[PDB]
């Protein structure tokens, strides 16, 4: 194992794409502004966004 | 000294009022949206907001 690769926390565009990808199973309403959510969260990882989506569905 | 009083980090409205109070000396342009700034910052204290305003003036 030679190549060391660092994987940081996601930025705004990646959080947009993560929130889009974690919601293709559920039907959401079209007035939900996901870009506003991704702008508001800074130190979140992918598991945190998945936790938010799961609590909403619950 | 009897009464213990805890003073937390400021919330959104307090950050709005801090950013307003730290700019009465300088002339700012009227298209600056301070409420957006106060919505974006969460863990900032008063010294951090004063630092931002000072770097802008510089």
């Amino acid at each position: 194992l030679d190549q060391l690769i660092y994987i940081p926390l996601p930025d705004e565009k990646s959080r947009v794409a993560i929130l889009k990808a974690n919601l293709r199973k559920s039907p959401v309403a079209k007035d939900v502004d996901l870009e506003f959510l991704a702008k508001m969260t800074n130190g979140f990882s992918g598991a945190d966004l998945t936790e938010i989506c799961q609590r909403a569905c619950k | 000294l009897d009464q213990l009083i805890y003073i937390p980090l400021p919330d959104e409205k307090s950050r709005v009022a801090i950013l307003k109070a730290n700019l009465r000396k300088s002339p700012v342009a009227k298209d600056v949206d301070l409420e957006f700034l106060a919505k974006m910052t969460n863990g900032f204290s008063g010294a951090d907001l004063t630092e931002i305003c000072q770097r802008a003036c510089k």
Binding site: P8, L9, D11, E12, N42, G43 | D31, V32, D33, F36, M40
Partner: peptide, 23 residues
């Protein structure tokens, strides 16, 4: 010295910060 210089870094974020261009 590089490590102490990196302890004085800004918050890891806030690049490409923009106000909403609202007419």
């Amino acid at each position: 010295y590089e490590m102490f210089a990196q302890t004085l870094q800004q918050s890891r974020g806030f690049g490409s910060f923009r106000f909403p261009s609202g007419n």
